Design a protein around this ligand. Sequence first.
Ligand SMILES: OC[C@H]1O[C@](O)(CO)[C@@H](O)[C@@H]1O
Ligand SMILES: OC[C@H]1O[C@](O)(CO)[C@@H](O)[C@@H]1O
Ligand SMILES: OC[C@H]1O[C@](O)(CO)[C@@H](O)[C@@H]1O
Ligand SMILES: OC[C@H]1O[C@](O)(CO)[C@@H](O)[C@@H]1O
Ligand SMILES: OC[C@H]1O[C@](O)(CO)[C@@H](O)[C@@H]1O
Ligand SMILES: OC[C@H]1O[C@](O)(CO)[C@@H](O)[C@@H]1O
Ligand SMILES: OC[C@H]1O[C@](O)(CO)[C@@H](O)[C@@H]1O
Lengths: 216, 217, 217, 216, 152, 152, 156, 151, 120, 118, 120, 119
Amino acid sequence: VSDFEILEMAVRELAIEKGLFSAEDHRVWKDYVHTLGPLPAARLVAKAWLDPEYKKLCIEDGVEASKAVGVNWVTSPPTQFGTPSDYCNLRVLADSPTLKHVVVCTLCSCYPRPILGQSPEWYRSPNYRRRLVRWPRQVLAEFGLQLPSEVQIRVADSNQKTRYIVMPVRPEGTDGWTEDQLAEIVTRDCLIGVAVPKPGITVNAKRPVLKANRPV
Amino acid sequence: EVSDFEILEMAVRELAIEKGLFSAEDHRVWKDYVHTLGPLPAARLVAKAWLDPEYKKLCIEDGVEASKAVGVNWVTSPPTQFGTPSDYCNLRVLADSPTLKHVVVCTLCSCYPRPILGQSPEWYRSPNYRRRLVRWPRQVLAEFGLQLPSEVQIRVADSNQKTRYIVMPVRPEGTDGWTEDQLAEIVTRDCLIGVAVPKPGITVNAKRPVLKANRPV
Amino acid sequence: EVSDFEILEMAVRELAIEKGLFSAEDHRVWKDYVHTLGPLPAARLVAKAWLDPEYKKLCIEDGVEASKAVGVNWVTSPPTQFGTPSDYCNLRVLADSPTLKHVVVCTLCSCYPRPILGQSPEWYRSPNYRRRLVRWPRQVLAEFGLQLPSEVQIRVADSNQKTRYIVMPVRPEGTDGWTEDQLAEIVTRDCLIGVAVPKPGITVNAKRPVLKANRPV
Amino acid sequence: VSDFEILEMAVRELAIEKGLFSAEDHRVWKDYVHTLGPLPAARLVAKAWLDPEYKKLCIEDGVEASKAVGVNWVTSPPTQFGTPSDYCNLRVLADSPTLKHVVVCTLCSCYPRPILGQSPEWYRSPNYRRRLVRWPRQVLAEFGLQLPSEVQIRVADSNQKTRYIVMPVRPEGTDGWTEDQLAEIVTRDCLIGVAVPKPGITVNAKRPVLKANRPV
Amino acid sequence: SSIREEVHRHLGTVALMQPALHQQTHAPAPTEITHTLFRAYTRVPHDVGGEADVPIEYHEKEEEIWELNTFATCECLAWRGVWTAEERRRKQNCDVGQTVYLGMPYYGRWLLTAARILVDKQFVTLTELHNKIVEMRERVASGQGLGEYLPP
Amino acid sequence: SSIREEVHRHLGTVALMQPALHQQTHAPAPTEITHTLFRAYTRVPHDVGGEADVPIEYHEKEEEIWELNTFATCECLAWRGVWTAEERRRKQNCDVGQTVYLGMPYYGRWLLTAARILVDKQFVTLTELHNKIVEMRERVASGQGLGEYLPP
Amino acid sequence: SSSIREEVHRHLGTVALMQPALHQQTHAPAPTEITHTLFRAYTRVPHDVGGEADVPIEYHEKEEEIWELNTFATCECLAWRGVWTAEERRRKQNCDVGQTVYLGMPYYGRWLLTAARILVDKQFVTLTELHNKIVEMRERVASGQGLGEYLPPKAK
Amino acid sequence: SIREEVHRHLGTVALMQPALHQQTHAPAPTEITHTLFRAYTRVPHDVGGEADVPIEYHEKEEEIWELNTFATCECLAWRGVWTAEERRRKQNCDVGQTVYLGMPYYGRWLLTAARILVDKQFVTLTELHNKIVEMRERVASGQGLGEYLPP
Amino acid sequence: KPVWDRTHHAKMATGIGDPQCFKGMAGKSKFNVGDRVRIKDLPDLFYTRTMTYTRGATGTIVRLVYESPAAEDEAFGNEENVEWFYSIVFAQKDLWPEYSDTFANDTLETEIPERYLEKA
Amino acid sequence: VWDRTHHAKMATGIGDPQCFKGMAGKSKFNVGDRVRIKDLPDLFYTRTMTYTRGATGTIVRLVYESPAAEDEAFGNEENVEWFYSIVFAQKDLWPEYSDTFANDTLETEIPERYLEKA
Amino acid sequence: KPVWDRTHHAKMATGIGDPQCFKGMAGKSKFNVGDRVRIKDLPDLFYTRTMTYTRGATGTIVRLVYESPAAEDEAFGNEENVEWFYSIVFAQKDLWPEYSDTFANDTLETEIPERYLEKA
Amino acid sequence: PVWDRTHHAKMATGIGDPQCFKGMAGKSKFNVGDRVRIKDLPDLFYTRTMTYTRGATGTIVRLVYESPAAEDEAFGNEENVEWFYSIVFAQKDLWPEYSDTFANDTLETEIPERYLEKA
Ligand SMILES: OC[C@H]1O[C@](O)(CO)[C@@H](O)[C@@H]1O
Ligand SMILES: OC[C@H]1O[C@](O)(CO)[C@@H](O)[C@@H]1O
Ligand SMILES: OC[C@H]1O[C@](O)(CO)[C@@H](O)[C@@H]1O
Ligand SMILES: OC[C@H]1O[C@](O)(CO)[C@@H](O)[C@@H]1O
Ligand SMILES: OC[C@H]1O[C@](O)(CO)[C@@H](O)[C@@H]1O
Ligand SMILES: OC[C@H]1O[C@](O)(CO)[C@@H](O)[C@@H]1O
Ligand SMILES: OC[C@H]1O[C@](O)(CO)[C@@H](O)[C@@H]1O
């Protein structure tokens, strides 16, 4: 057992002993977290690609649009007032032939957890947080993504209560595709903006995986 | 305001001359030779290559022989009559194409084709440029403001031995009917190194910060 | 120019007064009190102890009570009427002897017997002094010019809680018949800390480098 | 085998192959080194304590005095011109009731090998070389040695061709002692100056011993 | 491969030897603090955007059980009113100071700060926290197990 | 002596070039934190007794006007019950963290912490503190002067 | 504003100085403290930096100092006249100088020091002659008689 | 042992000592003051007077290779390959600041012994590189390596 | 000892959300979409969520995202004051001196509370 | 929210730590006892130096009663305990201490919670 | 006593050039254009011009550039042996593990003397 | 380029080093008792006159021997031989912080003639 596990046990037991939160509350939050994932966000993108009116809603009111995929930022979380850390102000950034977005939180790792799931380890790194806002073209290239020099690359720094998801442009070769087929290629990385959707690619690019001492 | 470097420079030069290692004339001659150096001959070679497919072939296969055409004989132009001691006599011209783009560096130091291109840029000598270009060329080139299609082969040439390189960029559009002087004019030092590409109307390296010397030449 | 520290000092003081945390008068009263502090009372306590065996016993057993004899009541002399907030009310006097010599430090910060001794020396607050004295007392004291027999017990007192100390060094040779004033005069601040011992003819701390303030009191 | 052992073998074979020195030369030197120790120096001190004339010789001509104890700085070494690194100019520093010496080589680890043996690991340390010359009283205190403030502590920095050995003052409680008895308490540390001879003490103060990977 | 692995270890290792003018700071006098240093020292640790950094091969990391529990604890504490997320960010990403901010792990700071809020708002005394840590250690040592981390 | 001054300047300067294996830490994973490092990182900054340090020629230092004013402020805040000296030491000598603890000046920490207590116990909002700082700067620049630090 | 932006960029650079690290000073450690990895790193040839991670920097040009031009000419003339070949220079200048000087001193500073070095190493001048020439040169400057093209003599 | 952990702690916290760490990447001449110039061009072995901390001095067992290196260096001098002063200059100064303090005492002796062979051309660097390979292969093939490793 | 209200936030935000629960509390916005604003370099002692890299730079307001107490206040338990938050777009060249003209259209969007804005 | 008169009302005319006198009850140890310092967790705050942990010393005086700094520094003064001045032999703290200075000592104060009979 | 020949290089290269002055001194080349070779990780103590980043990697010889003494020997005044130098092209992906497949055609060309090569 | 590997041995065998250089320095410039100041000569590449002694004044207590200066010997130049002196410095003249309590402490070391000038 590590010092972190000893302290985690200590803190949790004390909080419960003092009635700050119950054993039930803790299990409730972990269960909620287990219900999270990137699929809802991917489905929102697919729906937007297939419905111009819904796409308009996504761009103007991400919070309202999110209800279409079952994620109500206010009532879906156990709190019934949005998660304490993700809040209730989702904005959807729509890429276009002349605009491509990528998201970061230079101050920490603010992420749209309710609709996208948990944040990637690299997304929380001081490295990504220092470099993306200043050398987005270079960082994106490292991720294997390059866009025309005239295209506007916009870096969104989620430094306050707004959380973002990127709605990439629908890629070529998906004519007649169903909502499920389209959502399938809209990976987590696509929703962050470090990658774009491509037919046949249904998982994030393979990267080294640091193992945990005692994984969940 | 004489620095320790200026004191030592005088000491070394006077001692070498006093001991007869090299003459005062040799030193003046080398400085004058260096003063005649620059990027014009190299730019001229590129222009001629663009204007003559046969000369271009020569450039690609025999840089040393092709160099003679722009007044730069790597063996006899230098004061030594055996080429400069540090640049040697094996110039190779790297020809870019619609599917190939070259950029040059010397990770071990700052080897540069001085006889035909002049003195090396300060940044070219930097440990930073020398550490990064070979590994993250796309990223470094973007910093310089240059980006190529992902399918295009970017080739980094690391001049680590006796060969020195100059880059022959692809001829840009918008130059039909241009004369040799017109074309040579847009082939800057940066284009010859590979961190930039020739563009009509652009006849000088991209402006960047200039660190001033204490006592400039 | 005013420093960032002076700007912030003014900001904090004005806000505190404005919010009624403490009064403008409180601040002046505290500075006045601080201005009356110094090593003189502590030096007199030592002199009186040397001249009165019973008072010395009192000093060793009850520093707080003994301090009253030199006009320093740890509870009522400060403006609070409950002792200074930071120095508290538990002064202990460490009596050196032919087989014991004390030196004081506060490894955790710079706790000092301010009410009876004044403000702490800059070096006393240094991480350096706080790191080394408890472990290499013989070496640090030697640096200060003080050395004692190897058999003598050097005791380092680390004032880490609410107790504050002052060292009562042994009376030096060559002071036969000296009055209280004469004896107190040679008990300097440094003697009361323990980094020096009293010597006839020496009435000031050993001269050492003095770092000047940008804007001194 | 370590990188050091690989290189040592390479250098040795290369030197012998090129005829720079022979295998026998190497063996002869290792054997010579193996014979070196503090005994000769200890005896020199003991002899000086018992012979006023010899003491004066030690103080004025260390090289000449050294012969009296079997160590000829010129002829004892295999070269017959002194060891290449210790040279032939030994000086004996005589302590007195008002003078006490301690030796160091700030530039490296010059040591009177012919008459004293190999240098201690700590003697060669950058730490000892930085501090002794400036804070001798403090360093000696660390070694457990302290002298009256009025006594002149003199640090000798062996920076050129002279090597030193310290002749400490004869300690009390040694009346009637024979030469070998006296030499017995004159340890290596006493000859360096970080310790003084004491009746009953015949070995250097015990201190931590870092073990070698492949010793003996 | 084995050669390439040694090559890469070397490229990373030499960075440790990168020359520098290393000036240790030991409580320097006010006169040694320029406005530039004052701003750098009093900076808010989490504000790193724009700082020069090198390229690194980004990796994903497996979630530790204690990390998931720490996350749950922090959101539960906010959910139940002990603090708001902003109070957490300020205490967790700024108050911890420059050294801990970059020397310790992400969730390590979350955990330390969760313990911190309990003490700072006096829901538990530091003594209770210290005694509790002793309790967890003895629980492990006595072979009674530690939650889901170690069976008895 | 000019030469001696240069010699001592040299002896102090070469320390900057002392070789070392300098390992930058950028939020390493929990698996990279040993118990020894955990204890060193979560240490209480003010506890330095026993640490190896070099000999320094100790100096005295004149009191800055602001240092005296800072001292009086901290004692008055305690006098009037805003905090006890122990609360001050904990916040001032420990909570400031390793970097600020040794990088900033002694009284700089006292002052920063006096500002801290006002905000932490909500006697002033952080906004009021930020605003007061702006006003003070403008006061200085306008020629209006600044207390006993700068005459108008 | 420009003033504000300058302070911002000065700040972004300054904080790098405070980047936390585990700084382990090395004081002649025992052989048992040297791993193969460390051995290869310590015995590395300093000039071989290709591939090492580094940050982006706004590359700049730099005017040529008069002493740099003279140094360049001296180094090529020494090679021209057989004192050394360029490769001998590179080995001495970019490698033999060692890690610290290699990155701590200026590019041409290493050229110059190494030009002085070759004179001594091949015994074309004794170190004594070099030290003596430097002493005389310093006096020349301090006295006011000027120093070549670097400083004119004092006038009226 | 609690005391063991205490002393381990006291030594470990030194790694975290705050500092203004300024990396140097071939700075321009205008960034070099006379003070820095003297510090960079200093002879590494001249450490007398530099501030340092107290350390519990220890003795160290002799490595077989250290014994052989010492004998090799004295034999090279004995046989006129160099004088001890030439060795000191090359070993304690020419190695440079980083190696001077980063490597072991005898490690520098050894590196310098190999250096003199190459610098005075008694062996080419190629012969040295080849010999190193030969030693490694000898070990790998299981043929042993002198008194360090039996066949 | 002090007593902390652990039910306040929930009572206020339940069924409404954060920052929805602060809507209308900031009053009239000082700026509007399309306005050009410069970022004031307000003191950042102890806390701020207006990145240093934005200080003194000028951008365009593209949206009034919501109303909320400034983080500088919320992070210290002070929610009595609410202000407007704006999403501002900056041209990359106005933030980083080295940004290449080749990528002339690149931008950066982030949110800043009204207190940091001044007409540009 | 914060009581700014409690301390003054309690300590005025009495002093600190005098105002806590008698609140600790009976002392667990007495002058002369040999005690070892428990290495209690030190997270966030402590005034019991790391260098004393696990070391054994001699109690030479019961200096006063007062809430531990670990509690006082966080506004928790409900509990008061005895403080003891303890003397340690230098050699028991520092492994390298010289036998030449075998009589050297270090004295510092530690609250009852860190003590256990030696 | 040591005397250095300061005229040897000039007499040999004057009117010919370097490395032209070494032409034909290497004999027959061990490799030819098109050959796949792996870079041997030879000891690099004191000096080398075969970058660490190429060790153990496999590339394609695209040109026999010239003959010349190895820098490892020339840099120490040993010019008795001359060997062939080859210009080799490496796929970036074979040098840097993190290179992106998006830039699958990127390469690196550099020169290496015959001693460091072995058939792939 | 040939190096003479027999020179040193032929010169020093049966005599010793520095004995083999005796008489080659001629008349000494200084004598026992002389007060001398250490010149801060350039230390580029090599020196055996520690930086901590530069600019300090000491007392010559002995002319130890004659030998080529290390500055020359370390680069194979032994044609010139000079006198070496053992010099005693008062610790307070070297270290500003040295305590007056230890007013008699000293430091003795050797320095070749080239570094000395009459104080
Ligand atoms: O920090 C380790 C880094 O350096 C290498 O080992 C060599 O360049 C890389 O592959 C890795 O990303
Ligand atoms: O050393 C860092 C210190 O500051 C905090 O992170 C925040 O106040 C503390 O818990 C810790 O003790
Ligand atoms: O309490 C921690 C305090 O000191 C620094 O450590 C950490 O960022 C300050 O900014 C903070 O206010
Ligand atoms: O920092 C000033 C002091 O420290 C040194 O530079 C190095 O020990 C000394 O010579 C000087 O007295
Ligand atoms: O050249 C200096 C550059 O790097 C920084 O200091 C840090 O990233 C920048 O703000 C500046 O533009
Ligand atoms: O040439 C030898 C000199 O140059 C270096 O190797 C590099 O600057 C120095 O350490 C040494 O003193
Ligand atoms: O107590 C501090 C401990 O750590 C060191 O300074 C370094 O390892 C030790 O010698 C000492 O025992």
